[PDB]
Amino acid sequence: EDWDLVQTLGEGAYGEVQLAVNRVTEEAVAVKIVDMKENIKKEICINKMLNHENVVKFYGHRREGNIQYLFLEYCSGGELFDRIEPDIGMPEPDAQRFFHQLMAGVVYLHGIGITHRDIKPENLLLDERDNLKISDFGLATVFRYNNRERLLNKMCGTLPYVAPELLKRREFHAEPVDVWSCGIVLTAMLAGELPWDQPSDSCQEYSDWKEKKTYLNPWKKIDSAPLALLHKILVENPSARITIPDIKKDRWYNKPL
Numbered sequence: 001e002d003w004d005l006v007q008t009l010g011e012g013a014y015g016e017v018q019l020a021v022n023r024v025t026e027e028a029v030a031v032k033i034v035d036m037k038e039n040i041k042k043e044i045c046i047n048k049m050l051n052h053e054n055v056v057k058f059y060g061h062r063r064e065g066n067i068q069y070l071f072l073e074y075c076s077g078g079e080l081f082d083r084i085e086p087d088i089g090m091p092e093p094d095a096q097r098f099f100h101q102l103m104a105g106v107v108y109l110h111g112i113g114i115t116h117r118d119i120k121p122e123n124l125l126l127d128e129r130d131n132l133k134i135s136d137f138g139l140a141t142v143f144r145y146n147n148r149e150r151l152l153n154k155m156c157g158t159l160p161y162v163a164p165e166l167l168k169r170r171e172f173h174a175e176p177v178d179v180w181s182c183g184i185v186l187t188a189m190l191a192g193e194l195p196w197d198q199p200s201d202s203c204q205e206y207s208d209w210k211e212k213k214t215y216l217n218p219w220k221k222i223d224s225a226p227l228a229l230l231h232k233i234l235v236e237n238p239s240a241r242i243t244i245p246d247i248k249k250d251r252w253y254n255k256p257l
């Protein structure tokens with residue numbers, strides 16, 4: 001149980017992720033390396049609640065002086081982001097499959113009162129069977145406790161995926177915001193492109209979308225069935241926006257491919 005550090009698998013703010021393999025049992029893991037010179041105690045506290053096949057497995061922590069260590073399931077398939085060919089995307093049947101799994105993961109987190117708050121292709125990893133795994137709970141927080149919803153007010157995430165209500169509202173519900181980001185993801189997957197830099201009335205592309213101008217990119221690359229689902233998800237008003245139970249009833253979602 002001396003995981004030795006075979007190779008860097010990436011970098012970041014915090015620090016890096018190493019491919020730590022055992023040498024006796026040879027069991028691979030991803031290890032997160034975080035120079036504390038928070039946040040870390042919340043991400044662990046959260047990683048400790050999680051158990052699901054579309055959520056990235058948490059194994060342990062190790063304080064070790066100045067550097068925190070997170071032993072997390074290894075995803076040798078890499079990021080969904082690299083399965084998205086620019087300007088093209090991917091085959092509709094692969095996208096549907098990744099959406100299915102993504103929704104199973106999100107349902108699961110929401111079910112236990114947790115919101116991820118930064119859903120994007122970069123944070124969706126793929127194992128060697130290409131199974132989608134939600135990764136990175138550093139922006140993640142509790143929106144439900146003792147069966148009692150708390151609204152959010154900390155603005156965070158990544159702007160091209162963030163829902164309009166969180167740029168414009170003092171406080172807002174957690175669940176629609178993940179719902180929106182999942183639809184920006186789906187768009188990326190079917191088009192190879194992000195529609196806007198941000199969902200704000202000062203962004204031409206976003207104003208073009210609200211005006212149902214879907215003869216522009218990205219939308220013209222998207223077949224009508226998935227596009228009608230995107231019409232229900234990317235609803236500006238978070239109360240009018242589609243919920244996950246209803247996403248699961250939608251025609252494209254249930255289309256055999």
Ligand SMILES: CN(CCO)c1ncnc2oc(-c3ccccc3)c(-c3ccccc3)c12
Binds near residue numbers: 010011074075076
């Ligand atoms: C990024 N985290 C930690 C979050 O769980 C990972 N976790 C668990 N397994 C993983 O496999 C990877 C990975 C897989 C293939 C190539 C490169 C990396 C990565 C990876 C991804 C990007 C950057 C850094 C690392 C990864």
